[PDB]
Design a protein around this ligand. Structure first.
Ligand SMILES: [Cl-]
Length: 140
């Protein structure tokens, strides 16, 4: 359970993005946006290179989701929770030492097949080959 600095900034950026945008909860789409707002990790550059950018993610999000009753603190959705749990679980069995980077967080969103993050990623051109490609990057 040792989070990289860029993973921590990402989540923080995701939750703040959820408040900025007046969302009733903080979901997988915020995690994904959090990574891109952070923007300096290996996986963020990878996404940005394969046509997945904040602008397009922000856009693809409206195409999914008025909202005038959102709480001051948008709680994590169950899929967001499941994506973070997935990142923990994958790292605790990786049979290697290391911190859990933003790539684990991205594969966590990707592992949640009903999630808004899963959808948006596909809608932008992300696929299983690219996920094995990121999973290869996370191991070098
Ligand atoms: Cl990282």
């Amino acid at each position: 359970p040792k989070w990289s600095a860029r993973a921590i900034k990402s989540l923080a950026m995701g939750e703040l993005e959820a408040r900025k945008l007046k969302y009733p909860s903080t979901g997988t789409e915020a995690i994904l946006m959090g990574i891109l707002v952070e923007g300096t990790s290996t996986v963020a550059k990878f996404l940005r290179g394969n046509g997945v950018t904040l602008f397009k993610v922000r856009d693809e999000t409206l195409s999914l989701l008025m909202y005038f009753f959102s709480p001051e603190h948008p709680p994590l959705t169950e899929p967001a929770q499941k994506a973070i749990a997935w990142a923990i679980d994958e790292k605790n069995k990786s049979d290697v030492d290391g911190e859990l980077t933003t790539a684990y967080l991205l594969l966590g969103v990707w592992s949640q097949k009903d999630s808004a993050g899963r959808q948006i990623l596909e809608k932008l051109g992300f696929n299983e080959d690219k996920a094995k490609e990121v999973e290869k990057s996370m191991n070098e």
